[PDB]
Subunit: 124 residues, 2 copies
């Protein structure tokens, strides 16, 4: 299982702040600043209504992203939490894996989103 | 695949500065600040005698890394050059691909090192 997931972004200064778009909802981190967030070592998820101001980045299966960002090379001290609004994340992003705990879902998607933001520093 | 390579790093506080150790030589980017390197968009490769200050990160075949960090999402805007001392890079890191050009070799290893160095912000 697992329909392709859509990575989207907004420009934030000289990098990109990423989200996963599922229907008319965007899951992303409540992070004002990527370097601050990285050094702080924790983030909260938010799920927002799509305001029409996101840009498409990449559509691919989850595995495409997890393979690169949830792996043995990519160390992380980061800790992810979420709001009540975000408890849909497991069903929305891992529809094929009925098992998946909420802290795993957050951990996986959170590493993808922060990793993408960090590697946006290499982009045009 | 090919023989395993050894990913190594120096902890520079803000970030971990990654290299590839082959024997007593480390290939890495002549850059003190990964943020500067990323935004400036060009780097020079150097090959240095092991000064005993490197930390072991990971051992894996080259392909473990290339297959992740050379991709359609992050691209290849970055420009690499190298010192004359560093022209051994193709032979040392790609023994299995004897026709591989130097600029392809620099491009591939460069994207691995930039990616690991940027993603180290999750960890430090």
């Amino acid at each position: 299982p697992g329909p392709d997931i859509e990575l989207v972004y907004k420009n934030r200064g000289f990098y990109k702040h990423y989200g996963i778009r599922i229907g008319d909802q965007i899951y992303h981190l409540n992070s004002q600043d990527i370097l601050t967030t990285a050094i702080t070592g924790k983030s909260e998820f938010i799920k927002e209504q799509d305001d029409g101001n996101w840009t498409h980045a990449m559509t691919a299966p989850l595995d495409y992203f997890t393979e690169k960002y949830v792996n043995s090379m990519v160390g992380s001290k980061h800790i992810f939490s979420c709001t009540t609004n975000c408890e849909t994340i497991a069903r929305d992003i891992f529809p094929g894996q009925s098992g998946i705990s909420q802290s795993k879902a957050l951990g996986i998607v959170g590493l993808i989103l922060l990793s993408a933001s960090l590697l946006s520093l290499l982009a045009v």
